[PDB]
Design a protein around this ligand. Structure first.
Ligand SMILES: Cc1cc2nc3c(=O)[nH]c(=O)nc-3n(C[C@H](O)[C@H](O)[C@H](O)COP(=O)(O)OP(=O)(O)OC[C@H]3O[C@@H](n4cnc5c(N)ncnc54)[C@H](O)[C@@H]3O)c2cc1C
Ligand SMILES: Cc1cc2nc3c(=O)[nH]c(=O)nc-3n(C[C@H](O)[C@H](O)[C@H](O)COP(=O)(O)OP(=O)(O)OC[C@H]3O[C@@H](n4cnc5c(N)ncnc54)[C@H](O)[C@@H]3O)c2cc1C
Ligand SMILES: Cc1cc2nc3c(=O)[nH]c(=O)nc-3n(C[C@H](O)[C@H](O)[C@H](O)COP(=O)(O)OP(=O)(O)OC[C@H]3O[C@@H](n4cnc5c(N)ncnc54)[C@H](O)[C@@H]3O)c2cc1C
Ligand SMILES: Cc1cc2nc3c(=O)[nH]c(=O)nc-3n(C[C@H](O)[C@H](O)[C@H](O)COP(=O)(O)OP(=O)(O)OC[C@H]3O[C@@H](n4cnc5c(N)ncnc54)[C@H](O)[C@@H]3O)c2cc1C
Ligand SMILES: O=c1ccn([C@H]2C[C@H](O)[C@@H](COP(=O)(O)O)O2)c(=O)[nH]1
Ligand SMILES: O=c1ccn([C@H]2C[C@H](O)[C@@H](COP(=O)(O)O)O2)c(=O)[nH]1
Ligand SMILES: O=c1ccn([C@H]2C[C@H](O)[C@@H](COP(=O)(O)O)O2)c(=O)[nH]1
Ligand SMILES: O=c1ccn([C@H]2C[C@H](O)[C@@H](COP(=O)(O)O)O2)c(=O)[nH]1
Lengths: 211, 209, 211, 215
């Protein structure tokens, strides 16, 4: 499966895809083809693109999932922290993450202070579980940089809205990174639609600079 | 894959595409038989979100009065033949005499059927005449009756599909869309046998499946 | 508030939850610089705050119009049942002025007449079928697409602006354009700041800038 | 109408469009108590749910992130939440009472569970603040914050999607914390739409708690 690594331990993997560029074409005609996709994209006939659908498997920090899951025109199924024992996996920003901000302490110490809290919080979590505290309560001490996993099924129209909002400099850098991988898979599977999207409908800044 | 079921006199439901299978729900429930048991468990308890990861595209030819009921299902995608821009074909649902089974009628069912054909023919000829006169199609078509056939593509996931079958695969629904819902059910069954059996066994609220 | 549309149609306001401040409260999560914030939300595509303004309309429209209208899925509908009601002798007959700009072979007043004729013969066939013991749900299939229907429509400001982007526009059928113009006027009356910022920043259609 | 939930949370009613009769008028498409109340029961009993979509609520809700993350899986509703990338997060966190763990056999007194939870919260928060003073951006500084951090949001939901919410959350299979919130949602729905809430419970409600707990 197309699997792209994101952040220190994250990823976006493509589980499944229904259709391709021609799925939008046939829906539009209800039945020259590449010019029809450009045409549709240029004039804002977005509905035929709903007949292309993807399922992704995504491993992401909770603070990224939280932003992602705001996209309501999609289907999600996520790892359960109430009944599963949660794995020791946390997003630790690289020193380069703080490139462009003037800091009081070196970026290696910032990375160290994050790692410190993470380790303290996880130990506590494990101590609570061992003492017979239910997992659903014990987990509340875990930080927002804990990794979670989920399935995401989303059609090309909603995906393009996701890319307008997340493959953009105003989105938090971490989700941008996920959106770039989504765009990469989208492009591999639906090249005509992806290029037409960038040319006529894409509202973000980064995908027109990041090849 | 590909399946086509003919409905009414000139209608059809055709399966254009599918994403996933019964294991797509299982994979999703688990974020990846014990697997068949899981599908039944999900169905039994109304854990329906996993079934959203199974997706169908259908191509449907149905009368307008059927499509109008159908398109009330908002959790889906539609693209439909455009009467504003295309010259519309002479195809109309004429009920067979058997459609009036049960109903004691004043005129024999054949005459009912013939009365329907005649008004339809008259409406269509007027439509054509207006078009020949230079009347925009979007105006001319307003004389056409609700039994005119339209075509559309329908993309729907298994969860929304089960909602559709609950409502339309049911005696309280009009006979004509019931017939379509039976074709939708048969294709669903072919492609997702486990989910469909579990559905019928545990979740299905209608009465004709 | 009620606006008559076409020959026998209308759009009336049944209810509204909120006003421009409803969006402001939502965007701030609390409870002019308020009006600056509405324009800020609109200019930047921060549309979700407007979802917390909600209208309910009562609309009487021909079925062909209602079918275009009912394509707008992010809203709630309840329509008159034709399966069990005796349907009312009301049909949209176009004015002769409806064919202005079109050079036709028969007079526009004659087009109008041919439309009423069919309406009348169709309705009479329907009544004949009903009187014969044909169930209404079968008899009504002979009725033309210009038959008037009624529905309740509950829609939020955001979905309403989408609707006006697509329907308050010359590419939409004139008939639904007229209805969209009425929706816009009721929208403007209830939420003038949002309506004004919408027109300035986000509105994609053409006719609301003309009329 | 504002109801306190948990230790620092609440459900507050911001607005409402309609009442029981808004569903009746939608169902009839038309702009008599016993007749109207009968209609509501008939709709609910026969699963004609769509008329209830014409009633709509806006809540202001303050809840811990682990609760918000469950809630926000309800996609047929509208949401605006306070922003952690750009606001300085307030020192407010949910600390379970010892009574939250009564009837779990634990190796330590539930008071020590509270102290343990409270301890990490303080550390995480202190680290967060430490990072902010350093010039680390908030969007990054907050990732050390635990899942019991309180958040606030606006929720706009129609009575239909609200009743779904209650079936699933006003139910003992949902996490106890969200149950508490759902009972508050339910009491407010009941106050504003008594006939629909009662018909709902008699005919349509699949949860277990609203039939045992009054309001
Ligand atoms: C840079 C940035 C900053 C953000 N800051 C905040 C913040 O401070 N606080 C906060 O709470 N959120 C914030 N968000 C999240 C944002 O408000 C949306 O919830 C999220 O981006 C999903 O966008 P969407 O609603 O367009 O997508 P979806 O929910 O997938 O909806 C897709 C589309 O369908 C439509 N739609 C779906 N449901 C409805 C509906 N119920 N009514 C009307 N139309 C609907 C809309 O046209 C929408 O564009 C931010 C997002 C970005 C990119
Ligand atoms: C026998 C029969 C008679 C009918 N008679 C009439 C009539 O007289 N008049 C009339 O107008 N309609 C009538 N309908 C149509 C009916 O009111 C629904 O519009 C239609 O069945 C679509 O159902 P749905 O909303 O469940 O499906 P969808 O609209 O696809 O929605 C699927 C599910 O998602 C949810 N959902 C989607 N959108 C929302 C939302 N905005 N708010 C809350 N929840 C939402 C609900 O849980 C719903 O079950 C009839 C249907 C049947 C089967
Ligand atoms: C001039 C004109 C010509 C048209 N011609 C045709 C035609 O020939 N054939 C035809 O079938 N239709 C046609 N339409 C209808 C059109 O394709 C849409 O069905 C209609 O305009 C509703 O728009 P919407 O989907 O944006 O609105 P809604 O359905 O209310 O959706 C609102 C927003 O939410 C989002 N959304 C809601 N559900 C989904 C979903 N399941 N997936 C992805 N995003 C979603 C989208 O972002 C959308 O913009 C035409 C419309 C116009 C104005
Ligand atoms: C006890 C409990 C345990 C849970 N465990 C988990 C877990 O382990 N992992 C996890 O990821 N989630 C879990 N959830 C969340 C659950 O998966 C649902 O996302 C949540 O309950 C929201 O339900 P909903 O989809 O019915 O509501 P909404 O999303 O508001 O939808 C309301 C209705 O509209 C319909 N609808 C809306 N969108 C669609 C669509 N795209 N396709 C088809 N129908 C649609 C459905 O009819 C639905 O009933 C759990 C919930 C509960 C109560
Ligand atoms: O009772 C539950 C369990 C899980 N989830 C959803 C919310 C999150 O997106 C994800 C994991 O939540 P937790 O199990 O960690 O609470 O699944 C719920 O909505 N309700
Ligand atoms: O301008 C248009 C054209 C088409 N349609 C949708 C509505 C119907 O479901 C279908 C066919 O409509 P007509 O072109 O026949 O009006 O496409 C619209 O919504 N607006
Ligand atoms: O069985 C029915 C009856 C009505 N309707 C909806 C579709 C239309 O939007 C409106 C009126 O439909 P008719 O009863 O006229 O078919 O109500 C359905 O979806 N199914
Ligand atoms: O860039 C952003 C900022 C916020 N949010 C949403 C997600 C949460 O529901 C809430 C707060 O997110 P944080 O700012 O705390 O990440 O608003 C986003 O979706 N994207």
């Amino acid at each position: 499966h197309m699997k792209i690594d994101i952040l220190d331990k994250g990823f976006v993997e493509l589980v499944d895809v229904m259709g391709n560029d021609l799925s939008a074409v046939r829906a539009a005609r209800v039945s020259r083809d590449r010019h029809l996709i450009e045409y549709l994209m240029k004039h804002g006939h977005e509905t035929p693109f709903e007949h292309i659908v993807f399922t992704f498997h995504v491993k992401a920090p909770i603070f990224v999932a939280r932003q992602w899951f705001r996209h309501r025109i999609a289907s999600y199924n996520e790892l359960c922290g109430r009944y599963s024992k949660l794995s020791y996996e946390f997003y630790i920003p690289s020193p380069e993450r703080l490139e462009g901000y003037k800091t009081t302490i070196p970026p290696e110490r910032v990375t160290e202070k994050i790692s410190e809290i993470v380790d303290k919080a996880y130990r506590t979590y494990l101590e609570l579980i061992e003492s017979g505290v239910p997992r659903e309560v014990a987990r509340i001490v875990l930080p927002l940089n804990l990794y979670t996993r989920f399935f995401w099924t989303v059609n090309a129209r909603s995906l393009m809205n996701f890319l307008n909002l997340r493959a953009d400099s105003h989105a938090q850098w971490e989700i941008q990174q996920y959106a770039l991988a989504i765009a990469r898979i989208f492009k591999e599977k639906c090249p005509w639609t992806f290029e037409a999207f960038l040319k006529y409908a894409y509202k973000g800044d980064i995908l027109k600079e990041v090849q």
